[PDB]
Short mmCIF file of C-alpha atoms (C1' of nucleotides) and ligand atoms in Angstrom, two decimals:
data_model
loop_
_atom_site.label_atom_id
_atom_site.label_comp_id
_atom_site.label_asym_id
_atom_site.label_seq_id
_atom_site.Cartn_x
_atom_site.Cartn_y
_atom_site.Cartn_z
CA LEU A 1169 122.71 -48.29 -63.11
CA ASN A 1170 125.75 -49.76 -64.22
CA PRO A 1171 128.68 -49.88 -61.95
CA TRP A 1172 131.00 -47.84 -64.46
CA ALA A 1173 128.15 -44.90 -64.89
CA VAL A 1174 127.79 -45.24 -61.08
CA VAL A 1175 131.95 -44.96 -60.96
CA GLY A 1176 131.50 -42.08 -63.45
CA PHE A 1177 128.66 -40.28 -61.50
CA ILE A 1178 131.08 -40.40 -58.06
CA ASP A 1179 133.12 -38.88 -59.82
CA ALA A 1180 131.58 -36.48 -60.87
CA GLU A 1181 129.46 -35.53 -58.09
CA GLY A 1182 130.83 -38.18 -54.88
CA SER A 1183 132.56 -37.43 -52.08
CA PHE A 1184 135.70 -39.57 -49.95
CA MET A 1185 135.87 -37.85 -46.33
CA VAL A 1186 136.85 -38.35 -43.03
CA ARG A 1187 136.61 -36.33 -39.90
CA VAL A 1188 138.72 -36.24 -36.90
CA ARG A 1189 136.53 -34.19 -34.38
CA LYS A 1190 137.66 -33.57 -30.76
CA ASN A 1191 136.22 -35.39 -27.91
CA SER A 1192 137.57 -36.02 -24.39
CA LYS A 1193 135.34 -39.47 -23.65
CA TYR A 1194 137.86 -41.31 -26.21
CA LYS A 1195 140.74 -42.26 -24.63
CA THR A 1196 142.71 -40.20 -27.56
CA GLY A 1197 140.61 -36.93 -27.29
CA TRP A 1198 139.97 -37.44 -31.02
CA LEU A 1199 136.87 -39.39 -32.74
CA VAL A 1200 138.02 -40.53 -36.41
CA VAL A 1201 135.17 -41.00 -38.81
CA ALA A 1202 134.56 -41.67 -42.58
CA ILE A 1203 132.22 -40.63 -44.78
CA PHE A 1204 131.23 -41.75 -48.67
CA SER A 1205 128.49 -38.70 -49.64
CA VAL A 1206 127.10 -38.22 -53.03
CA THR A 1207 124.55 -35.05 -52.85
CA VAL A 1208 122.00 -33.96 -55.32
CA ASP A 1209 119.21 -31.45 -56.17
CA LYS A 1210 115.76 -32.71 -55.32
CA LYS A 1211 115.03 -33.74 -58.58
CA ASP A 1212 117.03 -36.51 -58.33
CA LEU A 1213 115.97 -38.64 -55.50
CA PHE A 1214 114.92 -41.14 -57.22
CA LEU A 1215 118.71 -41.51 -58.64
CA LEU A 1216 119.81 -41.50 -54.72
CA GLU A 1217 117.21 -44.42 -53.85
CA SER A 1218 119.08 -46.33 -56.83
CA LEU A 1219 122.40 -46.27 -55.44
CA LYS A 1220 120.89 -46.67 -52.21
CA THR A 1221 119.54 -50.09 -53.82
CA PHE A 1222 123.06 -50.11 -55.83
CA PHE A 1223 124.72 -50.53 -52.35
CA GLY A 1224 122.83 -53.42 -51.22
CA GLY A 1225 120.51 -50.84 -49.35
CA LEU A 1226 123.08 -49.84 -47.25
CA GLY A 1227 123.16 -46.31 -45.67
CA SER A 1228 120.84 -43.23 -45.27
CA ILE A 1229 119.38 -40.79 -47.45
CA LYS A 1230 119.49 -37.42 -45.75
CA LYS A 1231 117.86 -33.81 -46.56
CA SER A 1232 121.09 -31.84 -46.90
CA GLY A 1233 120.09 -28.43 -48.13
CA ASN A 1234 117.55 -26.11 -48.86
CA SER A 1235 116.32 -28.28 -51.63
CA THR A 1236 119.30 -30.98 -51.96
CA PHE A 1237 119.36 -34.41 -50.87
CA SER A 1238 122.35 -36.20 -49.55
CA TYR A 1239 122.96 -40.12 -49.87
CA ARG A 1240 125.85 -41.35 -46.99
CA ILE A 1241 127.63 -44.61 -45.76
CA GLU A 1242 130.02 -43.37 -42.62
CA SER A 1243 129.73 -46.48 -41.63
CA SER A 1244 133.97 -47.65 -41.36
CA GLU A 1245 132.63 -51.76 -41.13
CA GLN A 1246 130.05 -51.22 -43.95
CA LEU A 1247 132.60 -48.79 -45.92
CA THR A 1248 135.13 -51.82 -46.24
CA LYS A 1249 132.91 -54.58 -46.50
CA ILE A 1250 131.09 -52.93 -50.12
CA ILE A 1251 132.26 -49.44 -50.73
CA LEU A 1252 135.85 -49.98 -50.90
CA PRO A 1253 135.88 -53.58 -52.59
CA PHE A 1254 133.34 -51.53 -55.42
CA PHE A 1255 136.20 -48.86 -56.10
CA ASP A 1256 138.80 -50.78 -55.80
CA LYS A 1257 137.05 -53.16 -58.80
CA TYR A 1258 136.26 -50.17 -60.56
CA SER A 1259 138.39 -47.06 -60.03
CA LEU A 1260 137.83 -43.83 -60.44
CA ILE A 1261 139.78 -41.33 -63.12
CA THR A 1262 139.97 -37.74 -61.57
CA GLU A 1263 141.80 -36.34 -58.90
CA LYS A 1264 139.09 -37.87 -56.74
CA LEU A 1265 140.84 -40.82 -57.20
CA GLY A 1266 143.66 -39.76 -54.62
CA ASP A 1267 141.44 -38.89 -51.81
CA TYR A 1268 139.90 -42.54 -52.39
CA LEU A 1269 142.72 -43.69 -52.08
CA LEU A 1270 143.65 -41.63 -49.20
CA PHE A 1271 140.38 -42.51 -47.47
CA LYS A 1272 141.11 -46.09 -48.43
CA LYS A 1273 144.84 -45.75 -46.29
CA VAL A 1274 142.89 -44.71 -43.29
CA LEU A 1275 139.90 -47.08 -43.33
CA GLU A 1276 142.24 -49.78 -43.28
CA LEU A 1277 143.74 -48.20 -40.02
CA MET A 1278 140.53 -48.09 -38.81
CA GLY A 1279 140.00 -51.69 -39.84
CA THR A 1280 143.02 -52.87 -36.85
CA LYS A 1281 141.20 -50.76 -34.51
CA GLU A 1282 144.73 -48.45 -34.99
CA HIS A 1283 142.54 -44.79 -34.80
CA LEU A 1284 141.93 -45.70 -31.28
CA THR A 1285 145.61 -45.26 -30.23
CA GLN A 1286 148.34 -42.82 -30.68
CA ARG A 1287 149.94 -43.32 -34.04
CA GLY A 1288 147.02 -44.42 -35.69
CA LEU A 1289 146.32 -40.62 -34.76
CA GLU A 1290 148.67 -39.19 -36.16
CA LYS A 1291 148.45 -40.91 -39.55
CA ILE A 1292 144.78 -40.42 -40.11
CA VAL A 1293 145.79 -36.46 -39.06
CA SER A 1294 148.66 -37.37 -41.66
CA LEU A 1295 146.69 -38.93 -44.28
CA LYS A 1296 143.71 -36.34 -43.89
CA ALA A 1297 145.93 -33.68 -44.14
CA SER A 1298 146.26 -34.96 -48.47
CA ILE A 1299 142.59 -35.08 -48.74
CA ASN A 1300 140.04 -33.02 -50.15
CA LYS A 1301 140.43 -29.40 -48.19
CA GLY A 1302 143.14 -30.35 -45.90
CA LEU A 1303 143.34 -30.33 -42.21
CA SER A 1304 141.37 -27.74 -40.63
CA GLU A 1305 142.82 -25.12 -37.82
CA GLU A 1306 141.81 -26.50 -34.96
CA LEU A 1307 143.50 -29.99 -36.82
CA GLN A 1308 146.69 -27.99 -37.80
CA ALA A 1309 146.62 -26.24 -33.73
CA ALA A 1310 145.93 -29.64 -32.36
CA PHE A 1311 148.78 -31.46 -34.69
CA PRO A 1312 151.46 -28.36 -35.78
CA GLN A 1313 154.11 -31.49 -36.00
CA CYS A 1314 152.55 -33.57 -38.54
CA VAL A 1315 153.81 -33.98 -42.41
CA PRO A 1316 150.63 -34.56 -44.93
CA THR A 1317 151.11 -38.50 -46.14
CA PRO A 1318 152.29 -37.39 -49.99
CA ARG A 1319 149.07 -37.15 -52.21
CA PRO A 1320 148.92 -40.26 -54.73
CA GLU A 1321 149.72 -39.12 -58.68
CA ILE A 1322 148.32 -41.90 -60.49
CA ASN A 1323 149.43 -41.01 -64.09
CA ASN A 1324 147.37 -40.63 -67.29
CA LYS A 1325 144.05 -42.16 -66.77
CA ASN A 1326 141.93 -43.07 -69.61
CA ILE A 1327 138.17 -43.59 -69.77
CA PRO A 1328 137.64 -47.47 -68.82
CA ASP A 1329 134.67 -47.79 -69.89
CA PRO A 1330 131.67 -45.73 -72.11
CA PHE A 1331 129.02 -46.25 -69.30
CA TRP A 1332 131.49 -44.20 -66.97
CA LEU A 1333 131.02 -40.98 -69.03
CA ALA A 1334 127.76 -41.59 -69.23
CA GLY A 1335 127.78 -41.41 -65.45
CA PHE A 1336 129.92 -38.12 -65.02
CA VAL A 1337 128.23 -36.11 -67.99
CA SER A 1338 124.83 -37.07 -65.81
CA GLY A 1339 127.10 -35.25 -63.02
CA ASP A 1340 128.99 -32.55 -64.35
CA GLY A 1341 127.98 -32.17 -67.96
CA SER A 1342 125.46 -30.17 -69.86
CA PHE A 1343 123.36 -30.08 -72.84
CA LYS A 1344 122.53 -26.84 -73.48
CA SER A 1345 120.33 -24.80 -75.69
CA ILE A 1346 121.19 -21.39 -76.61
CA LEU A 1347 118.91 -18.86 -78.89
CA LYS A 1348 121.42 -15.45 -79.61
CA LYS A 1349 119.80 -12.99 -80.60
CA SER A 1350 120.87 -12.94 -84.81
CA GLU A 1351 120.86 -9.40 -87.17
CA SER A 1352 121.37 -11.84 -90.49
CA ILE A 1353 119.31 -14.76 -89.96
CA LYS A 1354 115.69 -14.49 -90.98
CA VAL A 1355 114.03 -15.22 -88.03
CA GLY A 1356 116.10 -13.16 -85.98
CA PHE A 1357 117.82 -15.89 -83.35
CA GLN A 1358 120.71 -19.23 -84.10
CA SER A 1359 119.71 -21.85 -82.41
CA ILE A 1360 122.50 -23.22 -80.80
CA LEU A 1361 123.04 -26.88 -79.63
CA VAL A 1362 125.66 -27.49 -77.07
CA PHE A 1363 127.07 -30.27 -75.20
CA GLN A 1364 129.26 -29.60 -72.48
CA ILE A 1365 131.62 -31.03 -69.54
CA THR A 1366 133.11 -28.89 -67.05
CA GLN A 1367 135.77 -29.50 -64.28
CA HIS A 1368 138.40 -28.15 -62.46
CA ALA A 1369 141.77 -27.98 -63.96
CA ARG A 1370 143.85 -30.18 -61.87
CA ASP A 1371 141.89 -32.70 -64.68
CA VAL A 1372 142.71 -31.07 -68.01
CA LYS A 1373 144.98 -33.93 -68.86
CA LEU A 1374 141.72 -36.09 -68.82
CA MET A 1375 139.63 -33.11 -69.78
CA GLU A 1376 142.09 -33.25 -73.33
CA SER A 1377 141.23 -36.36 -73.66
CA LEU A 1378 137.32 -36.20 -74.23
CA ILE A 1379 138.38 -34.86 -77.75
CA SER A 1380 140.30 -38.58 -79.07
CA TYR A 1381 137.53 -40.57 -76.78
CA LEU A 1382 134.90 -38.49 -78.90
CA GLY A 1383 136.51 -37.30 -81.96
CA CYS A 1384 135.35 -33.78 -81.38
CA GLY A 1385 135.06 -30.43 -79.70
CA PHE A 1386 137.31 -28.63 -77.96
CA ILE A 1387 138.96 -26.89 -74.30
CA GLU A 1388 138.35 -23.72 -73.05
CA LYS A 1389 139.97 -22.28 -69.62
CA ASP A 1390 137.58 -19.84 -67.29
CA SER A 1391 139.33 -16.95 -67.44
CA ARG A 1392 137.80 -16.42 -63.84
CA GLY A 1393 139.39 -19.54 -62.30
CA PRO A 1394 141.00 -22.76 -62.47
CA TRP A 1395 138.08 -24.50 -64.71
CA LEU A 1396 137.92 -25.73 -68.24
CA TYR A 1397 135.28 -26.38 -70.25
CA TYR A 1398 135.48 -29.26 -72.84
CA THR A 1399 132.41 -28.07 -75.49
CA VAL A 1400 130.93 -29.20 -78.69
CA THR A 1401 129.12 -26.30 -81.09
CA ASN A 1402 129.43 -28.10 -84.21
CA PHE A 1403 125.83 -29.61 -85.20
CA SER A 1404 127.24 -32.16 -87.44
CA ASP A 1405 129.31 -33.64 -84.24
CA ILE A 1406 126.03 -33.48 -82.34
CA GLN A 1407 124.54 -35.33 -85.09
CA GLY A 1408 126.92 -37.61 -85.51
CA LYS A 1409 129.17 -38.50 -82.39
CA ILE A 1410 127.41 -37.04 -79.73
CA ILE A 1411 123.98 -37.99 -79.81
CA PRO A 1412 124.75 -41.61 -81.09
CA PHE A 1413 126.64 -41.92 -77.72
CA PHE A 1414 124.09 -41.20 -75.20
CA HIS A 1415 121.43 -42.96 -76.81
CA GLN A 1416 123.57 -46.15 -76.44
CA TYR A 1417 125.06 -45.11 -73.31
CA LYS A 1418 122.21 -43.29 -71.18
CA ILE A 1419 122.51 -40.38 -69.11
CA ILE A 1420 121.06 -40.83 -65.11
CA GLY A 1421 119.03 -38.96 -63.17
CA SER A 1422 116.54 -35.94 -65.43
CA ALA A 1423 119.39 -34.91 -66.76
CA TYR A 1424 118.23 -37.82 -69.19
CA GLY A 1425 114.51 -35.59 -69.76
CA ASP A 1426 116.74 -33.06 -70.33
CA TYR A 1427 119.15 -34.77 -73.25
CA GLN A 1428 115.94 -36.21 -74.88
CA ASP A 1429 114.69 -32.58 -75.49
CA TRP A 1430 117.94 -31.37 -76.54
CA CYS A 1431 117.49 -34.72 -79.14
CA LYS A 1432 114.36 -32.87 -80.30
CA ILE A 1433 115.93 -29.41 -80.82
CA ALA A 1434 118.45 -31.44 -82.77
CA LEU A 1435 115.86 -32.88 -85.52
CA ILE A 1436 113.77 -29.58 -85.48
CA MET A 1437 117.00 -28.52 -86.88
CA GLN A 1438 117.72 -31.27 -89.07
CA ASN A 1439 115.20 -30.71 -91.18
CA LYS A 1440 116.14 -26.56 -91.01
CA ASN A 1441 112.58 -25.57 -89.22
CA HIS A 1442 114.97 -23.64 -86.54
CA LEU A 1443 115.19 -21.26 -89.40
CA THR A 1444 110.96 -21.23 -89.35
CA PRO A 1445 108.77 -19.12 -87.09
CA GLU A 1446 107.23 -22.08 -86.26
CA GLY A 1447 109.88 -24.38 -84.98
CA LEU A 1448 111.89 -21.95 -83.27
CA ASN A 1449 108.49 -21.39 -80.53
CA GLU A 1450 109.04 -25.62 -80.74
CA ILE A 1451 112.29 -24.84 -79.71
CA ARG A 1452 111.13 -22.36 -77.07
CA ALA A 1453 108.86 -24.59 -75.64
CA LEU A 1454 111.18 -27.39 -76.07
CA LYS A 1455 114.04 -25.31 -74.03
CA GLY A 1456 111.58 -23.78 -71.97
CA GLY A 1457 110.47 -27.21 -70.57
CA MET A 1458 114.23 -28.21 -69.92
CA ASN A 1459 115.66 -28.29 -66.04
CA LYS A 1460 112.20 -28.90 -64.68
CA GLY A 1461 112.13 -31.60 -64.26
"C1'" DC B 697 121.65 -15.85 -94.43
"C1'" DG B 698 123.85 -19.14 -91.49
"C1'" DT B 699 126.80 -21.50 -88.16
"C1'" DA B 700 130.84 -22.18 -85.41
"C1'" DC B 701 134.27 -20.83 -82.02
"C1'" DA B 702 136.76 -18.19 -78.96
"C1'" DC B 703 135.08 -15.13 -75.29
"C1'" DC B 704 131.98 -13.43 -71.41
"C1'" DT B 705 129.32 -13.67 -66.97
"C1'" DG B 706 125.46 -15.13 -63.18
"C1'" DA B 707 123.25 -18.98 -60.50
"C1'" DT B 708 123.71 -22.36 -57.84
"C1'" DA B 709 123.26 -28.03 -56.54
"C1'" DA B 710 126.91 -28.99 -55.54
"C1'" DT C 1292 132.25 -30.19 -52.91
"C1'" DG C 1293 133.01 -30.62 -48.06
"C1'" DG C 1294 132.40 -30.10 -43.74
"C1'" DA C 1295 130.26 -29.47 -38.60
"C1'" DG C 1296 127.81 -30.43 -34.32
"C1'" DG C 1297 124.33 -32.75 -31.36
"C1'" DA C 1298 122.04 -36.82 -30.22
"C1'" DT C 1299 121.69 -41.47 -29.88
"C1'" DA C 1300 122.71 -45.94 -29.86
"C1'" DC C 1301 125.86 -50.38 -28.99
"C1'" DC C 1302 128.69 -53.16 -25.98
"C1'" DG D 850 132.20 -45.15 -19.64
"C1'" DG D 851 134.26 -45.36 -24.74
"C1'" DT D 852 133.05 -46.10 -29.48
"C1'" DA D 853 130.39 -46.29 -33.37
"C1'" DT D 854 126.67 -43.92 -35.95
"C1'" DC D 855 122.49 -41.69 -36.81
"C1'" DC D 856 120.69 -36.78 -37.30
"C1'" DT D 857 120.57 -32.06 -38.50
"C1'" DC D 858 122.46 -27.91 -40.73
"C1'" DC D 859 126.02 -24.66 -43.48
"C1'" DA D 860 129.78 -21.71 -46.46
"C1'" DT D 861 132.08 -21.60 -50.73
"C1'" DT D 862 133.14 -23.18 -55.30
"C1'" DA D 863 133.15 -26.17 -58.89
"C1'" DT D 864 130.26 -26.37 -61.99
"C1'" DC E 53 125.58 -25.49 -64.50
"C1'" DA E 54 123.61 -22.04 -67.85
"C1'" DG E 55 123.19 -18.31 -70.41
"C1'" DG E 56 125.03 -15.50 -73.61
"C1'" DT E 57 127.76 -12.51 -77.51
"C1'" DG E 58 130.64 -11.32 -81.66
"C1'" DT E 59 132.37 -12.10 -85.56
"C1'" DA E 60 134.99 -14.65 -89.53
"C1'" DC E 61 134.12 -16.81 -92.93
"C1'" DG E 62 131.39 -20.43 -96.39
MG1 MG F 36 132.54 -32.19 -60.02
MG1 MG F 37 129.07 -31.55 -59.41
MG1 MG F 38 124.52 -33.13 -61.89
#
DNA sequence: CGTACACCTGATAA
DNA sequence: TGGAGGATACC
DNA sequence: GGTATCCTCCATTAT
DNA sequence: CAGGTGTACG
């Protein structure tokens, strides 16, 4: 685990969270907590174990869903000690940065015990209102006065290190093998390779910037909602640009075996064997093997 | 014959 | 992704 | 008591 | 994230 890879991976998968929960034991009647969270499927538990170890063995890993597990640090103290100084040095670049910085300001308030205070509380409520999904219904009603503190906007963010991209692709990227019915290929099917990164449209600009960074690909919009795709279909670019990149800058987690299989599919395609029935079945078999893992 | 971008849609693993 | 609620610990 | 963290579970949507 | 498909074009 490289630092930029981690930042990429968290740009893709992580969360920065604030809870303001109701409880009348607290002098304010409200308990304030901050949480840094990253959740993955079971097949990537070893990667959560790396992260913990990466962050000084801190925090806790727990069954989250039916086949996911979560890594969480919810101590304000140790968040201030370890997390904030990591992301302040190796900064996020998706819109998730806006949530990191707002989360940061809360911790800062918590750090001086202000959260235990009425003004403190409203500042944290004001800050929580611009983070992730905003105020809850309960908090809108308990704090009908508060004005969300403006979402910070940090313009034009560039990929700070090729490992960031390794990281993020390991999270929100994908190595696709498609077998497409073809009336004109003689073996019956086209063997397509697609590299693809998915992200919400709010990060259009970052998505656009990937075309210069990798010197290939194009961007599409999901017609069904605000979601973009950075896609590479062109096999020459996959051989020439994508495969060599991730060979130097390695994927993390399970997804790394899936890249290796896809690389292998590409060898078969390189020697033109995909147009042979034998090679088509090598590809069915590798494709079969992918995501297992 | 073969490939590649534009378009399409279902399943979760975030 | 991002959130909730109950239990427990800690000073 | 007041506060801070641990633990178990979940609805929706960005993957 | 992850499978497709339609079809223009060399
Ligand atoms: Mg993501
Ligand atoms: Mg993701
Ligand atoms: Mg992932």
